[PDB]
Subunit: 330 residues, 2 copies
């Protein structure tokens, strides 16, 4: 409603009134105002006034997605986009050189720290982000002792077990160098181990219905082939590894080829890709769940950049955290 | 290599006696030959003697069993051969009437009129079946724990996750058996039916291996093509009309035996075999057949004898216990 697109004009000369007042007005605005392009635009330039360029550009993109042809949105975005592109391009450059500077030594307990603790960290987070109520210590207990944890459903245990299986397959098959080509049967097998224990009838099997902002119809095998082909194409080595990974996750989640287990397998694929590219394990932490899902939402509006920024953020914070570990361990 | 001397003097003592007076008799001879048995189970002389003692106490089927083992352990042993020659047609008579008795008791199970007391039992029989069939394979979950997991969706903490998954998987397989493989529209038993049962048996506990057969420009004795083909031979034998003319119980025992010997899966063979047994028995109008874990030894003992060439003890075993099953339902009314 226009109570506050009208006050969006109150916030128009509040925006050319130079005040956190403008911001006030735009915030009560936004909280009450969903997909209305004028409101998004106003919010955008207000953000831009607070030197939030990428957030502003985001507002403009959402406005344009909800309203194709909005020429004010068009002229604002036309100006913001190239800036956002430079910024993102060495966001990537930065995480990459921080990666090259990770590869500075082979110490046995870099093996101990990294491999072991980040393995359990990985499994924990990947199932927790989907809603699993297991703790890290309980996840670890499950993998090492295989006894049952009090208060938890057999389904949660099984999600953990499945993930361990999938990870092991990934490591002892798809992460060798002799395995230079990623097959479609490999994605099927990853899903089969991911979901096997929790749902044996559906694990490793393509869905045979449509799901309820939609997802691709059951034309489905072809897109899987597409993904596989794209991964093995030589041109795709010229793309930034992180963007490559994000795009894999995105393609798979958008195809949504299984009845369940799509997200876990997508993060798995992401992780596979960047590990084959010399990166340590990438953990998308459960505390950032909201951000994660939020950015995926924007990805279905046609903008993959929030998600790329997300994956960048967390592979960088990950590597950064390891370094620090070594530095303290002196 | 060498039996202990005490066995030897057991045999020389027993070779000069066994007569009908008061300074020997039965259990004088028997206790001795039994201590001997306890020290040398595979000694043909002890088996033969023990046998003739059994025959004297009107334990014909057991006597015959002794002779069969003696001849199997000692190929060409004619003492065993002639003794068996006397015992065999009698035990055939005995067995045939056992089977007849079990069959008439099955016929009177099917005339029991379905009530709300019966469906109670039917439902409880799921838990009972799953418990026994997994306990036999070594699962340490209790009947109460099994029931709690299947009926209440509980979980026993501090206990193995794998055992939970085995319980759940078996229950799945059993439900599949009842709601797909018993519909009269099915008739033939396909290879996919056995595969589907295995896929449900092992699905939760070991998903990578479930419904999957264990796996020639080099040496190899095993081949997916060869194991698959042996399975095909099994199913074809099951659906062939000639084999419909044999007693369902014997058909079931032989099925169990054949599957266990091909052993087409990396694991879950025994469970799937008991399942197959049960499927066959149910399509012939029997209630589920529960081979109780309390009788585990007997179970394997009979299977032992099967590998010596004699499927009769096993047949007698499954007959005994389907009779106890039907009896479970009959007696509860």
């Amino acid at each position: 409603k226009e109570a506050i697109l009208a006050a969006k004009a109150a916030g128009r000369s509040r925006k050319d009134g130079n005040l956190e007042r403008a911001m006030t007005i735009m915030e009560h605005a936004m909280a009450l105002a969903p997909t209305n392009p004028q409101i998004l635009i106003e919010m955008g330039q207000i953000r831009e006034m607070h030197n939030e360029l990428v957030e502003a550009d985001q507002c403009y993109v959402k406005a344009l997605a909800y309203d194709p042809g909005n020429s004010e949105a068009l002229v604002l975005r036309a100006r913001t986009t190239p800036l956002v592109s430079a910024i993102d391009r060495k966001m990537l450059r930065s995480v990459h050189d921080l990666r090259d500077e990770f590869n500075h030594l082979q110490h046995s307990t870099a093996l101990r720290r990294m491999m072991r603790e980040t393995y359990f960290l990985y499994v924990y987070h990947t199932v927790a982000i989907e809603g699993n109520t297991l703790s890290l210590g309980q996840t670890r207990a499950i993998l090492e002792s295989g006894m049952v944890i009090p208060g938890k459903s057999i389904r949660e245990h099984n999600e953990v077990i499945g993930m361990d299986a999938a990870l092991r397959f990934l490591n002892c098959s798809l992460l060798s160098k002799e395995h230079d080509e990623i097959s479609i049967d490999d994605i099927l097998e990853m899903h089969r181990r991911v979901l096997g224990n929790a749902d044996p009838v559906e694990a490793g099997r393509i869905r045979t219905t449509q799901v309820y902002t939609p997802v691709s119809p059951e034309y489905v095998m072809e897109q899987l082939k597409d993904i596989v082909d794209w991964l093995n194409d030589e041109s795709t080595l010229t793309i930034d590894p992180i963007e490559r990974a994000a795009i894999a996750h995105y393609k798979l989640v958008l195809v949504h080829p299984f009845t369940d287990g799509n997200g876990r397998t997508a993060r798995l694929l992401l992780n596979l890709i960047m590990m084959r590219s010399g990166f340590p394990p990438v953990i998308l932490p459960v505390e950032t769940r909201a951000e994660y899902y939020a950015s995926l939402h924007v990805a279905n509006l046609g903008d993959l950049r929030p998600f790329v920024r997300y994956v960048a953020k967390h592979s960088e914070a990950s590597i950064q955290r390891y370094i620090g570990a070594m530095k303290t361990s002196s």
